[PDB]
A paper describes a structure:
[name] is a periplasmic flagellar protein that chaperones P-ring formation. [name] possesses a typical signal sequence at its N-terminus, recognized by the Sec-dependent pathway, suggesting that [name] functions as a P-ring assembly chaperone in the periplasm. P-ring formation is a key step enabling the bacterial flagellum to pass through the outer membrane. [name] can be divided into three domains, denominated as D1 (residues 1–74), D2 (residues 75–142), and D3 (residues 143–198).
To gain insight into the regulatory mechanism of P-ring assembly by [name], two different atomic structures of [name] from S. enterica, the open and closed forms were solved. Atomic models were built from amino acid residues Q1 through L198 (numbering corresponds to the mature protein) for the open and closed forms and refined at resolutions of 1.95 Å and 2.3 Å, respectively. For the open form, a segment from T44 thorough A47 was not traced in the final model due to the poor quality of the electron density map in this region. The conformation of [name] is different in the two forms. While the structures of corresponding domains are similar in the open and closed forms, the D1 domains of the two forms align with an RMSD of 0.64 Å, while the D2 and D3 domains align with RMSDs of 0.35 Å and 0.33 Å, respectively. Based upon the structural difference induced by crystal packing, we tested whether the closed and open forms were possible in solution. FlgAR113C-S190C is locked in one conformation, while [name] adopts intermediate structures upon immobilization, suggesting that [name] might exist in the periplasm as a flexible intermediate structure, or in equilibrium between the open and closed forms defined here. Perhaps [name] switches conformations from the closed to the open form after interacting with cellular components or other flagellar proteins.
Residue numbers in the entry: 1 to 43, 48 to 198, 202 to 213
The structure:
Amino acid sequence: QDINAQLTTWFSQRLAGFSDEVVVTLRSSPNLLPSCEQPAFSMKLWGNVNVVARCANEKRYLQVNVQATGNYVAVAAPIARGGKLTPANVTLKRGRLDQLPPRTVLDIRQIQDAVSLRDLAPGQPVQLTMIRQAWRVKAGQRVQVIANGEGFSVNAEGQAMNNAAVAQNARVRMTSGQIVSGTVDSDGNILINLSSSVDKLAAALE
Ligand SMILES: [Cl-]
């Protein structure tokens, strides 16, 4: 029961913070098990995984099944496409992590300012493919364009032409109809960082 106890302890410690119940089952032939007392294990965190087990003169490829139970983010109330994920409509549920659909959110902090891309039903695990970050800037919104660099500062008002989250690109129509583009910041401003532009900016003032 040596290898089974060692693998159980190894995956339990590796899964600290993800799971409080880790069960390991060997799927490969016991004839290909490491011979040494303390094999070095190395490596997907759970489910059907391959583990390399090294001993002096051995490099075993073990196939194991890892059952890991812990918390994951699930839908707690109906959420419409475009609906904000809140503490009223998404919660932590306890379940078999190894049976979850791909890219299920495990940490409730990952869903802060998230918005649903789909109509979601209660009990559904929240997957990264079902959600997006909220729009800090929305199409048609009055925004501030801030350009800085080479002893120059420009502050101008415009209308956001597209929806954009923080750190995403936003095109902005200036009052004349000229379109500029920059990065959305936490304040909903559009940031531009400035070779001929600093020369062009000064030339515009002439
Ligand atoms: Cl949004």
